[PDB]
Design a binder for these strands. Structure first.
Ligand SMILES: [Mg+2]
Ligand SMILES: [Mg+2]
Ligand SMILES: [Mg+2]
Ligand SMILES: [Mg+2]
Ligand SMILES: [Mg+2]
Ligand SMILES: [Mg+2]
Ligand SMILES: [Mg+2]
Lengths: 67, 70, 156, 225
RNA sequence: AAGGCGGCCCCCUGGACGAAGACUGACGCUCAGGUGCGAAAGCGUGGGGAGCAAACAGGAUUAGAUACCCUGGUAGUCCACGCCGUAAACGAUGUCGACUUGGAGGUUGUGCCCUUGAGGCGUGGCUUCCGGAGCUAACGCGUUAAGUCGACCGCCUGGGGA
RNA sequence: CUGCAUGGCUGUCGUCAGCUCGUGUUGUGAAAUGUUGGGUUAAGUCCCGCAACGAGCGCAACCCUUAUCCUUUGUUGCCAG
């Protein structure tokens, strides 16, 4: 597709956003690869960091099952 | 993945949905590579061998459009 | 009319399912006592057919050389795949001091006084091409004067 | 005629995409246009006129001009124009060795002389109809490939190539033999194997019609001496 | 730089690239001898040790198996401070400068035009695949050359012995 | 007696489909192309593309019977009338 971050001019990605960030994680808690998302390599490396921050702060689960 | 089946849903379609979810998650396909230890040397060799074929296919796709009508 | 000399005959052979089959390759050089000279490489099953095939290709691939009255114009060098030939003009009565496959090609090219030396792999098949390329790339006073805009008296 | 206005109205100025351009033919480039190259009329017209002058001179010299082109869009045109100028043509795929292997070309030429006389000799009698129709196809398909060079004698005296890039083998054979070549080269062609270079589009019905109308006219121009 | 580096955060810090500038003024390249870094394995001391796993035991195959198949299993692989400078340490291609047709990309920055959508034209660094001339014994290199030259160092002179 | 001196003959691979040559072209060269690749077939059968173009032994046909119909001659044969 196209990089929506560049389309909307989103300079930085913050982990605090969840409603517009859940679209980049699969139902199993795995990150949607770039070949499927249609995202540039500049923003994929920032999306991964934001998702990791959210996982650390219990904003996005690592996987569907935890306990 | 949670595949809790609701009412008025056949077991056949429920099991097919569960199988499709497992396939898209790729959990079954990960054991065939996590069942043994791959050396970093072997992993890098496999990665380049897969990368070489992956654009060789596209190179041939873009090169076969010049001749060989059928 | 034209003079011709075949330099070396080889006994190359192939291998097939039922055994090994034989063949012959003949290298010949043709000239006319003047700057016209050519080489041919024929492949057949016997020496007469091979040399007769090589002669026709040599005649059809003859090339012209801007040689002098009895020698060459200036010293030249020819570089091929595995042969490095160096030829230089000589004076009256010196003769053709050359060895290998160069003597025959010089004799049929008509140069009577010449000193030649080969370095590298001295196989006839490559050395003939090396010396032919060296002789074909040499210049003449008239040609160099024409290409530079000067006169033969000026560049003496 | 040689009119640049006619060339522009026919569409000679177009070429191919900029990703296929041959780097050895850029002086003949007017500028990129939507990733498509445009040739130079100011350079195409004089060279074409000089080539036509040389062609009619060599036709007055009574030379055997052969047109060669295997394009499907310019298939019937190179024949309707070769018949007009009373010359020889090849329209199907170029048989490698047509010029170099002239002994075997003449052998095939005489095969389709015995078989040609078979049609007159009513020899389709000493064999049943299956035999007859097999022989009929054997001449039909044998004539539809090399029929333009039956009444030609030996090698042609000059060559005219519809597209040099596609018919590069004919260029090489003609250069090896020593035959002058007038090839219609494009932005993706190689203008180094031909002594006469004709810039402009090579795959266009109007462009090839203009080229053939000029060539046949100048050939009849020179023949009428 | 090479060896090599992959959750996240914090502190110190090296290196690399770009628009527009300002500034010293040949201060530049290479470099025997020397210095430093340097995969893994190995050694010494002090720790730790989940999994894996030399040596070792048992089981299995085989005519035989001191091995490949299996169950255990110590050193070691994990940490700190010390020693060696060994690899197919490879791009089997030494360091630096200039020139030489083109095409299709990846990554990173900047300039301009109406940026209504990664719309369009340019412009530097790294990197990937074809490919022209040219080179090569040929495979092949091919603007990141193995194309033509310039400056320097190291190495080669039949295979064994070694 | 010697089919381990042979002629002639025969069987199998196998009616399997390949085996070669001339010219040209390519590579310094040994050598390659043709004979390879997609459709198709029983097939190197046919087509297209491709430095290949053609040819020989070759795949089929031309040879022998059956299957519709025509004419000729009618005995030792037929009884349509
Ligand atoms: Mg260690
Ligand atoms: Mg074990
Ligand atoms: Mg055991
Ligand atoms: Mg080394
Ligand atoms: Mg240094
Ligand atoms: Mg390349
Ligand atoms: Mg096929």
């Amino acid at each position: 597709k196209f990089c929506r971050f560049t389309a909307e001019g989103v300079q930085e990605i913050d982990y605090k956003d969840i409603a517009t960030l859940k679209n980049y994680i699969t139902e199993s808690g795995k990150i949607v690869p770039s070949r499927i998302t249609g995202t540039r390599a500049k923003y994929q490396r920032q999306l991964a960091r934001a998702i990791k921050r959210a996982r650390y702060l219990s904003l996005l689960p690592y996987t569907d099952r935890h306990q | 993945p949670v595949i809790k089946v609701r009412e008025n849903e056949p077991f056949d379609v429920a099991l097919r949905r569960f199988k499709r979810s497992c396939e898209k998650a790729g959990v079954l396909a990960e054991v065939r590579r996590r069942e043994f230890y791959e050396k970093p040397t072997t992993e890098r060799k496999r990665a380049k061998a897969s990368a070489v074929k992956r654009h060789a296919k596209k190179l041939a796709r873009e090169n076969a459009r010049r001749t060989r009508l059928y | 009319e034209l003079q011709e000399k075949l330099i070396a005959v080889n006994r190359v052979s192939k291998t097939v399912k039922g055994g090994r089959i034989f063949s012959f390759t003949a290298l010949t050089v043709v000239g006319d006592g003047n700057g016209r000279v050519g080489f041919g490489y024929g492949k057949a099953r016997e020496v007469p057919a091979a040399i007769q095939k090589a002669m026709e290709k040599a005649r059809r691939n003859m090339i012209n050389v801007a040689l002098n009255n009895g020698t060459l114009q200036h010293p030249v060098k020819g570089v091929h795949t595995g042969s490095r030939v160096f030829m230089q003009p000589a004076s009256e009565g010196t003769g053709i001091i050359a060895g290998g496959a160069m003597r025959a090609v010089l004799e049929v090219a008509g140069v009577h006084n010449v000193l030649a030396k080969a370095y590298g792999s001295t196989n006839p098949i490559n050395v003939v091409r090396a010396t032919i390329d060296g002789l074909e790339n040499m210049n003449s006073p008239e040609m160099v004067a024409a290409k530079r805009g000067k006169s033969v008296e000026e560049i003496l | 005629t040689v009119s640049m206005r006619d060339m522009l109205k026919a569409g000679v100025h177009f070429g191919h995409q900029t990703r296929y351009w041959n780097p050895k033919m850029k002086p003949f480039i007017f500028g990129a246009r939507n990733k498509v190259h445009i040739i130079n009329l100011e350079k195409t017209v004089p060279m074409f006129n000089e080539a036509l002058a040389e062609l009619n001179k060599i036709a007055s010299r009574k030379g055997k001009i052969l047109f060669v082109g295997t394009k499907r869009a310019a298939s019937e045109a190179v024949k309707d124009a070769a018949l007009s100028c009373d010359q020889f043509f090849v329209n199907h795929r170029w048989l490698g060795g047509m010029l170099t292997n002239w002994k075997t070309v003449r052998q095939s030429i005489k095969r389709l002389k015995d078989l040609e006389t078979q049609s007159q000799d009513g020899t389709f009698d000493k064999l049943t109809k299956k035999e007859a129709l097999m022989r009929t196809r054997e001449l039909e398909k044998l004539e539809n490939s090399l029929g333009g060079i039956k009444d030609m004698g030996g090698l042609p005296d000059a060559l005219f190539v519809i597209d040099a890039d596609h018919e590069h083998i004919a260029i090489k054979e003609a250069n090896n033999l020593g035959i002058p070549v007038f090839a219609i080269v494009d932005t993706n062609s190689d203008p180094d194997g031909v002594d006469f270079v004709i810039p402009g589009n090579d795959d266009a019905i109007r462009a090839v019609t203009l080229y053939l109308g000029a060539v046949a006219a100048t050939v009849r121009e020179g023949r009428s001496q």
